[PDB]
Amino acid sequence: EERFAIVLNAMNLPPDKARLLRQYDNEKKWELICDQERFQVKNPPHTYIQKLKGYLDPAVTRKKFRRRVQESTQVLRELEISLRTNHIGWVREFLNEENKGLDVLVEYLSFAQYAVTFSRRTLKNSRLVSKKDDVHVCIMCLRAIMNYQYGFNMVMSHPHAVNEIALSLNNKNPRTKALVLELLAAVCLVRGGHEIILSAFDNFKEVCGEKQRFEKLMEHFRNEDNNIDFMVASMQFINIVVHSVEDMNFRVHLQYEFTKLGLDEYLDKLKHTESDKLQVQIQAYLDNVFD
Amino acid sequence: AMQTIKCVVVGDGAVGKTCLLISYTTNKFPSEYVPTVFDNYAVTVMIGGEPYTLGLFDTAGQEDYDRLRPLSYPQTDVFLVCFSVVSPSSFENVKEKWVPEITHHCPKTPFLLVGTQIDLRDDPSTIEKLAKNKQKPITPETAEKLARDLKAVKYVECSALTQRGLKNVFDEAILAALE
Ligand SMILES: Nc1nc2c(ncn2[C@@H]2O[C@H](COP(=O)(O)OP(=O)(O)NP(=O)(O)O)[C@@H](O)[C@H]2O)c(=O)[nH]1
Ligand SMILES: [Mg+2]
């Protein structure tokens, strides 16, 4: 049947799950088809894109700005659900030449984060949206865009997107930091990713005024007593960034970078952890290290 | 003119949604874990002297079915948003995933917050596992506060294994759907 293998494509299923669905009685497919027809999406991509443009418009007095953004978090959550659960075509439209959804999203994230990152008016305005969950939800939106192959590619090729994702590492919510690290790790693992990541962390250093790159990454990682998931994500990312490179001499330079920031001494204590999730990341790193 | 009620169950993978549905309708607890894609069951129920058909819809918890799951949503009368009381992570996903997701697709539809697997809340082996990962089980109080903040109709808990609280979960869902 063929009005099914088209509904199948709209769902962005991994090959193993698509195969499983395919071995379905021709009757069930029909029910699925009926289910799609019954299904209508809430809004088109430009609905959300326009709202985000409204929040960014500096020609607006403070009044309308404060009133416009009073629902910003709600709108972002609806965009995220739309990106994550609508038919994949909804995402293509969002990302397309008419819409330029990825640009506005990256732009809003940058704005939401401008305050945290260190015109006085926009610095005031930013502080308004920087204590809400907006940043975190933008990162979630990027995550949904990235689960779509074509969308992942646009994130890579984008001038600012991974730069801004890296900047979110400064967000004080450890749950947010974890997600950022997971995104950063995924990019780093594909061909061409490592350079984009290093460039992002060079950019981070300059804007944030670090002494050495990865400085604040290490700070947060050392400073965190309580959130195992963030620690798992930190260790994992560190292990990918030093040990996935092609050039062995580059691998050792990267290794020593983290050594000079006290990772080795920190892992000395940390390896005695009780958490088996964290245990495996630390082990993987120790196994990869050179003498 | 037989009256209908559609109830949809959501929450993280391995939270217990299928067991609770099966233990309630069927009175047996299924021992083998088989991850759901989509399923539905139907039951007849009497409230205030009137019979209703209670449609029950099981969903996939895992993210890979994220674009498949919303096909289960239209015409929903009440949602059960489930998390395991011994899985803080599943509790967190309530706020970040499940409530945003049903409110987006089905505005103005009531939901209950459902804590599952309460039998495990006192199991030392379970307490021990959470402990190694700097975690503890969710207390009724904590869950009740979240239910308030997210505007759930109410908070309820159960064990599909012991059937404790199980009936009352569905009692509450029915009432929530007819209010
Ligand atoms: N102790 C205890 N274990 C339970 C209970 N309910 C479910 N489980 C166990 O939890 C595991 C998964 O339950 P299941 O209902 O399959 O989860 P699910 O929520 O449908 N996951 P999915 O989204 O993949 O379908 C199984 O091991 C089941 O045995 C309970 O009330 N008590
Ligand atoms: Mg199941």
Author numbering:
A (entry chain B): 32 to 149, 205 to 377
B (entry chain A): -1 to 177
Q: Which sentences did the original study use to describe this structure?
A:
To explore the activating complex between Cdc42 and FMNL2, we solved the X-ray crystal structure of the GBD-FH3 domains of human FMNL2 (amino acids (aa) 1–379, termed FMNL2N) with Cdc42 (1–179) bound to the non-hydrolyzing nucleotide analogue GppNHp. The FH3 domain of FMNL2 is composed of 14 canonical helices that assemble into 5 armadillo repeats with the first 2 helices resembling a heat repeat fold. A loop sequence of 55 residues (150–204) that is not resolved in the crystal structure precedes the second helix of this non-canonical element. Strikingly, residues of all five armadillo repeats of the FMNL2 FH3 domain participate in Cdc42 binding and contribute to the specificity of the interaction. On complex formation with FMNL2, the carboxyl groups of E95 mediate salt bridges with H222 and R261 of the formin, thus coordinating two armadillo repeats of the effector protein. Polar interactions and a salt bridge are formed between the amino groups of the two lysines K133 and K131 in Cdc42 with acidic residues E311 and D360 of the fourth and fifth armadillo repeat of FMNL2, respectively. The interaction is sustained by a hydrogen bond between N132 and S361. The sequence motifs 93RKKFRRR on the first and 206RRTLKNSRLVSKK on the second helix assemble in a way that all 12 basic moieties are exposed on the surface of FMNL2 at a position adjacent to the Cdc42 binding site. Particularly, the Rho-GTPase-specific insert helix α4 of Cdc42 is involved in interactions with the fourth and fifth armadillo repeat of FMNL2, contributing thereby to the specificity of the formin recognition.
The mammalian formin-like proteins constitute one family of DRFs, which include the large, multidomain proteins FMNL1, FMNL2 and FMNL3 (also known as FRL1 or formin-related gene in leucocytes, FRL3/FHOD2 and FRL2/FHOD3, respectively). In DRFs, the N-terminal regulatory domains comprise a GTPase-binding domain (GBD) followed by an FH3 domain that interacts with the C-terminal Diaphanous-autoregulatory domain (DAD). Here we uncover the structural basis of the specificity of FMNL1 and FMNL2 binding towards Cdc42, its membrane association, as well as the dimerization properties of the formin.
